[PDB]
Amino acid sequence: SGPVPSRARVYTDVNTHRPREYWDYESHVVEWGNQDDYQLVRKLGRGKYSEVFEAINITNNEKVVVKILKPVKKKKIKREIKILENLRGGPNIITLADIVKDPVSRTPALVFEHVNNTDFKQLYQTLTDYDIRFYMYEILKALDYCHSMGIMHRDVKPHNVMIDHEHRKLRLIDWGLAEFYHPGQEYNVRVASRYFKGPELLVDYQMYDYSLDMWSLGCMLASMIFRKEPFFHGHDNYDQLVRIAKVLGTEDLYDYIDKYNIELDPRFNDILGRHSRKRWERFVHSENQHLVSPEALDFLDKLLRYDHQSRLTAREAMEHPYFYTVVKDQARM
Numbered sequence: 001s002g003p004v005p006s007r008a009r010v011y012t013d014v015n016t017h018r019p020r021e022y023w024d025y026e027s028h029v030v031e032w033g034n035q036d037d038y039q040l041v042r043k044l045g046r047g048k049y050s051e052v053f054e055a056i057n058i059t060n061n062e063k064v065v066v067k068i069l070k071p072v073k074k075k076k077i078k079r080e081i082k083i084l085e086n087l088r089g090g091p092n093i094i095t096l097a098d099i100v101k102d103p104v105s106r107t108p109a110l111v112f113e114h115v116n117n118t119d120f121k122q123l124y125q126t127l128t129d130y131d132i133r134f135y136m137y138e139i140l141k142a143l144d145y146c147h148s149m150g151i152m153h154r155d156v157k158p159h160n161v162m163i164d165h166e167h168r169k170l171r172l173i174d175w176g177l178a179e180f181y182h183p184g185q186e187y188n189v190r191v192a193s194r195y196f197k198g199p200e201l202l203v204d205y206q207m208y209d210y211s212l213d214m215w216s217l218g219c220m221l222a223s224m225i226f227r228k229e230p231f232f233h234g235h236d237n238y239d240q241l242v243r244i245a246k247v248l249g250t251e252d253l254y255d256y257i258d259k260y261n262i263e264l265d266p267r268f269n270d271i272l273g274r275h276s277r278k279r280w281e282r283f284v285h286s287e288n289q290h291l292v293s294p295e296a297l298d299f300l301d302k303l304l305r306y307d308h309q310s311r312l313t314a315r316e317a318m319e320h321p322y323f324y325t326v327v328k329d330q331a332r333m
């Protein structure tokens, strides 16, 4: 018969208990402002597939970031707006300041609070042990918040984390793939960037939850403490699962597939083979050993599980011994 159903271990019913308007983004009515309140200063480098500008609010001479929404379903645009409005003011969440259309092209754009175009990817292979712990804890505050608000990010990766290293400030950005969690909803598995895709995405298990973000976070942590970018380096989406299976082992993979009665794409039958679960010590060498501790490996091991239900929640992660010194230093401000 079909795949075995799954529910989030935490924040399972939070959208059900909200008014319909909170999560029913298709029925959201946007008041569209005038892009002529803003003057674009310069294009920010965000890849071939993104149009983001530094701009000035000409009324108050404030710096902002403008994101021009490349043509895409109006439903996706409402979804990102409604999620950004719901999360506005949450810890380490980017602030949506305005929603505007070009008066001529009528192209929709999002206006955000200014952040420097310094993403985590530029910094996260040069950090101290303490700074990896510090910024991981700041990312967890954003994830525990959006999860508690019934939202999964689904595109957690270094490029989507903006850091002001001088002020030790972080923002989680690009909510364009984010969704509301509803118990029993089957989601699109064609989300996230290859190297950060959870096993649920790779084996086509659609009834996933907030725990997807916790896999992505584990991939980022592994890349940082082992200085191995990316940690799971697949040629394509099929090879991605093989790269995972060569570390996590095939026994736990086939147990996962059996537990949720997953129908494994036939292409997997040749390429997964048979692999032991590897000890993390295998990835430790003289140029990363200063970032690796028993605490870091214990924490990483609890994020990188095939079974999405087994992974730490954001709040459980924030309680791990890996963050004791960060928590203590925060309480003393």
Ligand SMILES: Brc1cccc2nn[nH]c12
Pocket (backbone or CB within 6 Å): 044, 046, 052, 065, 067, 094, 112, 115, 173, 174, 175
């Ligand atoms: Br770049 C950038 C900056 C601020 C918010 C953003 N949301 N998506 N990309 C963003």
Ligand SMILES: [Cl-]
Pocket (backbone or CB within 6 Å): 121, 157, 158, 159, 160
């Ligand atoms: Cl990235």
Ligand SMILES: [Cl-]
Pocket (backbone or CB within 6 Å): 188
């Ligand atoms: Cl989607």
